[PDB]
């Protein structure tokens, strides 16, 4: 079993005594402490080569210091605004994603500096086994699947659709994604699918109760007009059939 270093355990104990005192927590000297925590925590949790048993051992050790110390450390964000949940999703380290979720204190809706949540990162992450998709759907159910990115206001569903990821689209819809959300430019997931020519994804979106094919983007384009213009007459016929 992996154990914290003397220095790390020391920093955890210092946090424990200070965690309830906000202005001490923000003090310049306390920062050297917090930097130790951040450095060692990201070292063990956030590389592609992170070892799940080590992350598990570290989580258990933080909670033994204090549940509040566990909550503080596993929600730390680095200089990129990334949490361990962002990195472990991006790396498709779904055993580690599961350990973080099961600690039951993750803020899954945290936007990194790029403007994206871990649910949005999952929409593009490699998933090589259906069991990994179980962890992805747990993630989807722990946070806000309808959140909009700071860049262009896109949702996870729009991201998945734009990459033609039928698997992710099915997952997101099964976990309650709203098909009708519009990004900052007024585009829907259905419009994204129409641009890319993704026929099966169009059928999946149209099959959702309440899918609104009439929505316009800020220039008055519809999924139907977009499909024709992008040269996807088959989707256009599909859209027409659904709208009428």
């Amino acid at each position: 079993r992996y154990e914290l270093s003397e220095k790390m355990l020391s920093a955890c104990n210092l946090l424990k005594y200070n965690i309830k005192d906000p202005k001490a927590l923000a003090s310049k000297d306390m920062r050297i402490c917090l930097n130790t925590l951040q450095h060692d925590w990201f070292r063990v949790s956030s590389q592609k080569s992170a070892v799940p048993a080590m992350v598990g051992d570290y989580i258990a050790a933080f909670e033994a210091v204090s549940p509040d110390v566990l909550r503080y450390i596993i929600n730390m964000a680095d200089g990129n605004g990334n949490t361990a949940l962002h990195y472990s999703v991006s790396h498709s380290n779904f055993q580690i994603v599961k350990l973080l979720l099961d600690a039951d204190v993750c803020n899954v809706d945290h936007q990194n500096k790029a403007g994206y949540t871990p649910i949005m990162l999952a929409a593009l992450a490699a998933v090589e086994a259906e069991k990994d998709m179980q962890v992805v759907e747990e993630l989807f159910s722990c946070g806000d699947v309808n959140a909009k990115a700071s860049q262009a206001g896109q949702t996870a569903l729009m991201l998945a659709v734009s990459h033609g990821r039928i698997d992710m689209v099915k997952g997101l819809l099964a976990c309650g994604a709203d098909v009708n959300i519009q990004d900052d430019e007024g585009s829907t997931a259905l419009m994204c699918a129409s641009e890319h020519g993704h026929v099966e994804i169009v059928k999946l979106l149209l099959a959702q109760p309440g899918c609104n094919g009439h929505l316009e983007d800020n220039d008055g384009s519809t999924a139907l007009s977009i499909a024709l213009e992008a040269g996807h007459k088959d989707i256009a016929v599909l859209l027409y059939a659904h709208l009428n």
């Binding site: 990129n80 605004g81 990334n82 962002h86 990195y87 991006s90 990194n112 500096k113 790029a114 403007g115 994206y116 949005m120 990162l121 593009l124 992450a125 860049q151 262009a152 206001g153 896109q154 729009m158 991201l159 734009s162 990459h163 990004d183 900052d184 430019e185 585009s187 419009m191 994204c192 641009e195 983007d217």
Partner: peptide, 15 residues
């Protein structure tokens, strides 16, 4: 338009 653009895994992770 964002709906036409490609976003990469690295673009989601780093600004």
């Amino acid at each position: 338009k964002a709906r036409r653009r490609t976003t990469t895994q690295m673009e989601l992770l780093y600004a």
